[PDB]
Symmetry: D3
């Protein structure tokens, strides 16, 4: 139940008024929010986040879009939260996503897919370290922890 | 993003108070409503709509049910809206549909499955031409088009 | 229970993705939808709709805004639907409206107040005649009429 | 449409404020509630309910958890309500469940999976007989029965 | 926080599929459900419930309507739950009720106002004693009690 | 439309899973989120926030409760957002609040009223300066600004 993942609401999700609904999906599931901030990060940070894609033809445009508005950055904690978080977000391409997921409810275009979620435990650790100062993670205990686990 | 599909809320969907929720599924996804009207169409129009099924034993009863109350007829526009619209509606037989879809949330009986969606691009074109006068399609641009695509 | 009112979702309501929610407020209350269409009406029709305001300094801009996108025009039927419809919409100025109403949930600016509702029975009759052809009103009986009245 | 299933909201579902939402899933689908009560049943009743699991190492702890708070016991009626009810609940292990189901929206841990549903028609009959006195099942006809079937 | 009130979803509320939403209003507010059952009570019980109205011309019809379908009977517990429960239900006449309340969201006719709530602490005690056997009230402690009070 | 207010979800709101819903109220209204972070601030900061109440008998307990879990701190921007934000939150004492507001939907006890909102423009400025570093306010333009104003 200590696993953590990085979930980010991308500029299109913020612009389209989806902060509340997206948070609610994770909150209602029983996962614990341990960090959150609204940020407009520097270009260098976005280039590091997508470092594995730096040689793709779409990299410059992806970085430009991720700079084009605010981002709601979050760390969520709970059992299997990386993989289950990806399941809640739905398929990366919304055309392949299931209604009932975030992208299956709210998105159409893979290049405007509303949100990001870490794709692995190790990548989650790297992304958490990239987007948050260590002191921004909040230690607390949910009143319903023993009813969720 | 110019593809269009015909979505109709059937008399059971209207009767059961599902107009708002059904519209919201397509609206929240990012698709654009370009035509809509509440109609009680003539029998001839319903027989033409289901022309491919005219030799089925259930055809007369299907037509009678489709005449038994108002229908909310709609044209929705967006990328892959025909196939993704069918995915949002869920399996034609609600027993085979997934929770999170319209039929998986709201319907039980294949003969009372709340809504219709075109099954192909070409059939969508035929259905749009059948149910709407050409001037009833509205040309407009969504303020969030560049955030959806 | 035969009283009718004209409710219109203005271009800002359509643009902001509020068709579904607004319909749901009236639908969930128990009122009966007897006419609906998505329309981009001619300027002359909008000038007639706001004829009582034709001498106001804001008239030209109001007409221009009402022409600036599609409108979801509706006729709703039920007991006291004119006055109760106005109550559901909330105060014309959203700053004076109560949370729980359409404007108190969704709007800020009196000039962008998302929706219109007839202000009297007689004005409702005039507005229904202006916006709808008489054949566009649908006669039907709700399956739950005797549970609402 | 006469098939019945036993659905129970477990103590964790009650504690986490999920009675309303869970009821709504079945209600919105078109199934008919024919029995319901909030109960804190005796240990003997819970041991009989899970009799098929009495030799499992987790049996004592399962019984203790099921005694640890109130349970919302329900009988729902409709076509294929046993299997479709299980589909609405989602996979028994929430990690394997789909967003859009009860467990895929609300639960994480198989030992805290919020709700129970009969796994077969015959087991439903046994569970209904166990949890309800025969007079607690209510005979009524939904006003929209002929619009659901 | 020990005050209790009797809330009943009337046959029209059950018929119109409002059990879930109504429960959610009280559940989300922080009140504690301590008793609930779906019941079709005898005529004598309904006549005793409305004993103070037995000389009204509408008494026979009121009793007949309250017998015409199932009722979801509930006891809710919390600070000021009688008066605040009445506030959540809204004005007895839905025409005088505020959107955001149960009747202001869901009802039109005072004779079909979806729900009942005790009008005073003493009447709540009488109604609880009338509708529930004393053993049907469940003693439990909410995991979030100290976060609500 | 440049006015700003400080809205904070208190530890009870976070604990009870209300971050998403509360954000949605402001988001759906049309206000712009310009700053947000999840924080567990130092005692000194909470004592400064409630400096005007430092001589009240309840001050120590209020500070202790505000330290007892995380807080979701936010800056929202829009016309009349201070006063309208207070209206959205509802009366400070939830017993005096209207259903449809945050406290009228979610809270009971004035000492556990889920959220804080600045009570004046000048106090909002002081609170924004207290809770946020100046660089944490994000400059951006909503895609629907001209449809809200």
């Amino acid at each position: 139940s200590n696993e953590q993942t990085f979930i980010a609401i991308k500029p299109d999700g913020v612009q389209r008024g989806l902060i509340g609904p997206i948070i609610s999906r994770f909150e209602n599931r029983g996962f614990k929010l341990v960090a959150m901030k609204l940020v407009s990060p520097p270009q260098s940070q976005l280039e590091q986040h997508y470092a594995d894609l730096s040689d793709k033809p779409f990299f410059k445009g992806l970085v430009s879009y991720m700079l084009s508005g605010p981002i709601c950055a979050m760390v969520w904690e709970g059992r299997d939260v990386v993989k289950t978080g990806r399941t809640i977000l739905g398929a990366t391409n919304p055309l392949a996503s299931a209604p009932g997921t975030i992208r299956g409810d709210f998105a159409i275009d893979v290049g405007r897919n509303v949100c990001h979620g870490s794709d692995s435990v190790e990548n989650a650790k790297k992304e958490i370290a990239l987007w948050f100062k260590p002191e921004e993670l909040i230690s607390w205990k949910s009143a319903t922890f023993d009813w969720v686990y």
